[PDB]
């Protein structure tokens, strides 16, 4: 019969107020024969109706992939509430239930440090600004950079790496022109995390 997978929101999204976090409920192959799917969604076992149905997609298998999307409130996801997707369909005898939620673990506060370029780099015409972020748990986090109220988008951010105490660290590198660094401009490393006061903090870096 039809198979079903449930998916969590993308981690940054649960922290960026400008993002919208969604749990996805994927139903794979439903027969061209009996193609209609019912979705029922429960939040901590309580039925909800704001879910968006996507138009079915034809699969090279000659089969139907059907998705329903459910937007979640940030604090709901952070506070560990359970999201259930119940699928119904006739290529199938009994409704299948799947449940998901946020992972367990005592959250820990990210420590943030910005380190200026090494003087050895100041011979190149672009230089690297580093933001070390460490001691954080879970790995769900968002880092970004800004200068003078405008965002700086020329940065890359390593994935979180597990440390010897079971916490995570990562580094973010912002590459800028040496003349911007050298002039005395103020750059800022910005971090969003569940375990920060107001879920957010920032650190400056200047010459």
């Amino acid at each position: 019969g039809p198979s079903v997978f449930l998916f969590p929101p993308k981690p940054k999204d649960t922290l960026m107020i400008s993002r919208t976090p969604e749990v996805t409920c994927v139903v794979v192959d439903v027969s061209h024969e009996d193609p209609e799917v019912k979705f029922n969604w429960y939040v901590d076992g309580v039925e909800v109706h704001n879910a968006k149905t996507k138009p079915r997609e034809e699969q090279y298998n000659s089969t139907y992939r059907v998705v329903s999307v459910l937007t979640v409130l940030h604090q709901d996801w952070l506070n560990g509430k359970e999201y259930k997707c119940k699928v119904s369909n006739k290529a199938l005898p009994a409704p299948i239930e799947k449940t998901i939620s946020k992972a367990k673990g005592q959250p820990r506060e990210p420590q943030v440090y910005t380190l200026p370029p090494s003087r050895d780099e100041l011979t190149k015409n672009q230089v690297s600004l580093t933001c070390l972020v460490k001691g954080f748990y879970p790995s769900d986090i968002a880092v970004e950079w800004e200068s003078n109220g405008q965002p700086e988008n020329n940065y890359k951010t390593t994935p979180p790496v597990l440390d010897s105490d079971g916490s995570f660290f990562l580094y973010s590198k912002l590459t800028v022109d040496k003349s911007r660094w050298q002039q005395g401009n103020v750059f800022s490393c910005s971090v969003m995390h569940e375990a920060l006061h107001n879920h957010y903090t920032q650190k400056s870096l200047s010459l």
């Binding site: 952070l78 957010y200 903090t201």
Partner: protein
Amino acid sequence: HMVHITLDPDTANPWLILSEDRRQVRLGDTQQSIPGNEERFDSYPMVLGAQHFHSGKHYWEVDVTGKEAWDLGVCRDSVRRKGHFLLSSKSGFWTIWLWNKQKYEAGTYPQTPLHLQVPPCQVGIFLDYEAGMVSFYNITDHGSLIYSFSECAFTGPLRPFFSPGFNDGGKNTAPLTLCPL
């Protein structure tokens, strides 16, 4: 020196529910659909009080009974409202706050920890414009002083600041209530 304060509905973040008298505020679970005006905080559960301060001594109280997080203080009227930012005395904010149930902090940069043997249930906020000062009192502990900002300068208008906090842990749904004085 007491002052009757009302929460300004144009400042209020859309996830907040103000009361009809405008003397309480709590963080609700739906987003209210309302104007996107300049004056309004778009990324934190924060709210201004209606008053604008230009001079003088001003004093009010807030009740925090049962809460695991909030923020309180005065601020420049000029503070930025759109986006993320730090509550910091270098940046127009003279605030203290509670988070994570039990951690109290003063909004100096970097931030100053506060050790309170008696957790306040009410907090008094006193502003003395010409003295360049903002002080906080633990009304539960006889009025003891919690923390004082000084040499604040003060050029422009100042506004009372409030935020009921985020609801990490699920047991921060009570509101701030301004005390009748």
